[PDB]
Amino acid sequence: GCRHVAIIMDGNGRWAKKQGKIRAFGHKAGAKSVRRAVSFAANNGIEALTLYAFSSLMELFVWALDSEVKSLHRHNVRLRIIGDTSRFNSRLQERIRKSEALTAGNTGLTLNIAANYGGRWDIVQGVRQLAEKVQQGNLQPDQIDEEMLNQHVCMHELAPVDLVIRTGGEHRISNFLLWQIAYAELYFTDVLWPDFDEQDFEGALNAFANR
Amino acid sequence: LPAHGCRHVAIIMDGNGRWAKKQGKIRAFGHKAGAKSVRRAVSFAANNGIEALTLYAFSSELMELFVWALDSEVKSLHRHNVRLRIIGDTSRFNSRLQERIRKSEALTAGNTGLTLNIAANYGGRWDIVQGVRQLAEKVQQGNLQPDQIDEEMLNQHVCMHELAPVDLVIRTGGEHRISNFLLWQIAYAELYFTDVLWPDFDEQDFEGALNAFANRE
Ligand SMILES: O=C(Nc1ccc(C2=NCCN2)cc1)c1ccc(C(=O)Nc2ccc(-c3ncc[nH]3)cc2)c([N+](=O)[O-])c1
Numbered sequence A: 001g002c003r004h005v006a007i008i009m010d011g012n013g014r015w016a017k018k019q020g021k022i023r024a025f026g027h028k029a030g031a032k033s034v035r036r037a038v039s040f041a042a043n044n045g046i047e048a049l050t051l052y053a054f055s056s057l058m059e060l061f062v063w064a065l066d067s068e069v070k071s072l073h074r075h076n077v078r079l080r081i082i083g084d085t086s087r088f089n090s091r092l093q094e095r096i097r098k099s100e101a102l103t104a105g106n107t108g109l110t111l112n113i114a115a116n117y118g119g120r121w122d123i124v125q126g127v128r129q130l131a132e133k134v135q136q137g138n139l140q141p142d143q144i145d146e147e148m149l150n151q152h153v154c155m156h157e158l159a160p161v162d163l164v165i166r167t168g169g170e171h172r173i174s175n176f177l178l179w180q181i182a183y184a185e186l187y188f189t190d191v192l193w194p195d196f197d198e199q200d201f202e203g204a205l206n207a208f209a210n211r
Numbered sequence B: 001l002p003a004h005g006c007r008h009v010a011i012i013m014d015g016n017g018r019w020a021k022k023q024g025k026i027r028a029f030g031h032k033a034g035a036k037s038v039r040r041a042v043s044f045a046a047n048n049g050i051e052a053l054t055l056y057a058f059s060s061e062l063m064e065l066f067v068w069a070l071d072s073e074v075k076s077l078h079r080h081n082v083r084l085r086i087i088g089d090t091s092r093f094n095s096r097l098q099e100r101i102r103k104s105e106a107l108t109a110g111n112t113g114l115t116l117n118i119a120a121n122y123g124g125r126w127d128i129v130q131g132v133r134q135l136a137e138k139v140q141q142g143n144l145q146p147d148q149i150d151e152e153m154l155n156q157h158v159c160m161h162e163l164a165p166v167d168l169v170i171r172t173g174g175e176h177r178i179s180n181f182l183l184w185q186i187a188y189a190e191l192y193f194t195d196v197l198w199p200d201f202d203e204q205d206f207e208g209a210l211n212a213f214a215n216r217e
């Protein structure tokens, strides 16, 4: 059973170019593909879906999400934004906080949207926290272990990441999740993100089920 | 940079158990064939301009015996101008073994050819945590402020930070996963998975991985 899937959603700009259209067109097709993947995961009992918007700008991508919130809530989706939003404009930060709190109680799919996220950043923010605790004398350097750092990195309340999918044909993690992908299956496909569809997602889930 | 572009390659060497099973042999024959394949890869990397090779002995099918085995290769590595380092938590290793590791490292530290890093009782999470503990000690002595901690600083405290970043990770044996080998250090690395079992992975396979990295960037 695959409980938590993460996807690096690459290929929207390459897709636009192949279609003979401006980069913007590729965003809008990428957004359709977001909806389809979120629906498919919610329909197939996946617990958590973590989406990294990446292209081989982040504010705006989050803005575009703002109008989907009412629909996600109605579908019992818990929405979280992961990543360093602390320099986003304060109006956007308030909307993120409002959407997360609206849905925080939902018990269906948890959808994590990584915004201005980096795996090294995620670890460093958790290390900064431990460092504050040591300085305040609340923690001995030496009590620090994997389990404790794990509690200070993103998504520690969710099932571990079982499967990472990257569309778009590159074979890297690109500083998406690092700590959390120690034991995840890595599935790379040349399909571009706007084309990735239910059969492609099932293909990735077979890879997991075979292993 | 060599034409392939790769300064540091890391290899998850899986498949030795499977290879021995396919032949009707016990696991020890797979380990001896896997050792032949290490010598061959080390020789290939050294002849191909690679700066650093990092090897993670892993079977999908103890750690301390692997490192005893390596102790018998140290003279030969030295003779081939290889600089040898062990990465991993060896602090609970047999006291004799820890002294043999130290001396093999000191013996070859002057070498100018390939740098070979052998992971022994290594895990990517462990490596991040030991880096974090060195930082927390500096905070507890009043030398470091929590707010001065950034990526660059934590980078300076994980294994291999003084070598070229890892450009390419090869995993043999058919599984598509990192299995808690390098994690901080592979943020930008090319990942190359091949179904070839470790004992069968030969120069043409290694050339093929390098040229796939060169072609993909
Ligand atoms: O990325 C999105 N929108 C978007 C639009 C435009 C752009 C854009 N960039 C600049 C040019 N256009 C970017 C992103 C997007 C779209 C739909 C959705 C979304 O999931 N909608 C949605 C609504 C309902 C359901 C659903 N159905 C069953 C259970 N859940 C599933 C999905 C999300 N999302 O995360 O939720 C983001």
Ligand SMILES: O=C(Nc1ccc(C2=NCCN2)cc1)c1ccc(C(=O)Nc2ccc(-c3ncc[nH]3)cc2)c([N+](=O)[O-])c1
Pocket (backbone or CB within 6 Å): B028, B031, B032, B034, B035, B036, B038, B039, B040, B042, B043, B065, B066, B069, B070, B073, B076, B077, B079, B080, B118
């Ligand atoms: O893993 C190794 N040996 C080994 C043997 C047995 C076992 C074993 N485990 C349980 C059963 N037996 C495990 C490991 C091994 C073998 C050779 C080497 C090795 O690289 N030796 C070497 C020696 C010489 C040269 C060389 N010299 C000049 C041309 N090239 C190149 C490489 C290494 N190594 O890390 O360097 C490990």
